[PDB]
Design a protein around this ligand. Structure first.
Ligand SMILES: CCc1c2[nH]c(c1C)/C=c1\[nH]/c(c(CCC(=O)O)c1C)=C\c1[nH]c(c(C)c1CCC(=O)O)/C=c1/c(CC)c(C)/c(n1C)=C/2
Ligand SMILES: [Mg+2]
Length: 306
């Protein structure tokens, strides 16, 4: 019986939880009334918060079921650990420990390694396990290069391009993005930026797309600079330089239909394309599709040498 610790940033399960989620992200400070209202507005804008938290649940559940289905050596038990939403990462480890689990494999629902989004989760998780004792966690650190994951996006892209009208297919620009982070991660030699660039190349060459670019999105609002250029500005600058008739957005850094994709892409990036008279394209996110789950299953099994 092995533990399967699945971690992610987290999304509120109920609208009544939006505020605390914000506080947690703001590290103890409740958001300003307007600031809070502006987040609530965005969730409504995309159809409600309700569906979002369910996707992460289905991903972990399906991953557990598939891993236990494709091989008979190990029986996995999934535990969700989130950064800003209960069950928190430390709560999930505590529960694995309480349940008697002595060995566990963890994986973050973000393909690129970064200090802020993968290393900090693994660290928090392992430190809690050590404090409890008798629980050893083996952590997946990056999987953006897993061929089945790359293939997933390559196929979604080939399809989008093959469904475009003639004019666009010859004047389209592919934008591969991930969640931006403070530039100070460089102080730690964080390869996050490099992994994104490689992720973009792998997908572009796989789909046979030659015109593509790398951008960042969803940066937080702090006094420090964040990884740029932002997808919105990148789209404008690229249009100004070649007048592309279409932009295809691949938020490879994200795995589900969350706020960053449904809003920051489907709304804010479409605002830019609409403004410049270009079509907007954004292939389906992995969510809990079997093709994606099989990719994660292979990633976990490989980490275990199986
Ligand atoms: C899911 C994509 C993502 C998000 N944040 C990070 C990532 C990887 C990382 C991060 N977001 C960050 C940080 C910490 C930056 C730091 O250490 O200063 C990381 C690693 C926080 C941040 N994020 C935001 C703010 C305003 C801040 C600063 C909070 C403060 O006032 O202290 C904004 C959000 C929000 C809405 C609350 C979301 C959903 C969110 N951030 C941008 C997205
Ligand atoms: Mg924003």
């Amino acid at each position: 019986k092995m533990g399967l610790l699945v971690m992610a940033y987290g999304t509120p399960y109920k609208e009544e939880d939006i505020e605390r989620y914000y506080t947690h992200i703001r590290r103890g400070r409740k958001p300003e009334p307007e600031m809070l209202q502006d987040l609530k507005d965005r969730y409504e804008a995309i159809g409600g918060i309700s569906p979002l938290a369910q996707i992460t649940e289905q991903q972990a559940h399906n991953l557990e079921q598939h891993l236990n289905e494709i091989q008979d050596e190990i029986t996995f038990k999934a535990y969700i650990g989130l950064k800003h939403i209960e069950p928190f990462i430390e709560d999930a480890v505590a529960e694995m420990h309480k349940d008697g689990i002595t060995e566990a494999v963890s994986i973050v629902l973000a393909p690129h390694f970064s200090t802020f989004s993968v290393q900090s989760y693994n660290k928090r998780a392992k430190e809690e396990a050590e404090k409890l004792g008798g629980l050893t966690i083996t952590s997946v650190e990056s999987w953006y290069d897993e061929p089945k994951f790359v293939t997933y996006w390559v196929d979604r892209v080939k399809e989008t391009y093959a469904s475009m009208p003639e004019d666009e297919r010859e004047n389209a620009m592919l934008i591969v993005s991930a969640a931006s982070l403070p530039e100070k991660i460089k102080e730690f030699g964080d390869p996050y930026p490099d992994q994104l660039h490689e992720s973009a190349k792998l997908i572009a060459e796989g789909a046979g797309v030659s015109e593509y670019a790398v951008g960042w999105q969803s940066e937080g609002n702090t006094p420090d600079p964040w990884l740029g250029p932002d997808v919105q500005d990148l789209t404008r600058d690229l249009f100004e330089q070649k007048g592309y008739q279409a932009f295809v957005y691949v938020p490879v850094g994200f795995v589900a239909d969350h706020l960053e994709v449904l809003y920051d892409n489907d709304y804010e990036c479409k605002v830019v394309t609409d403004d410049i008279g270009a079509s907007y394209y954004r292939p389906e996110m992995p969510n809990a599709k079997p093709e994606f789950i099989d990719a994660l299953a292979t990633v976990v099994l490989k980490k275990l040498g199986r």
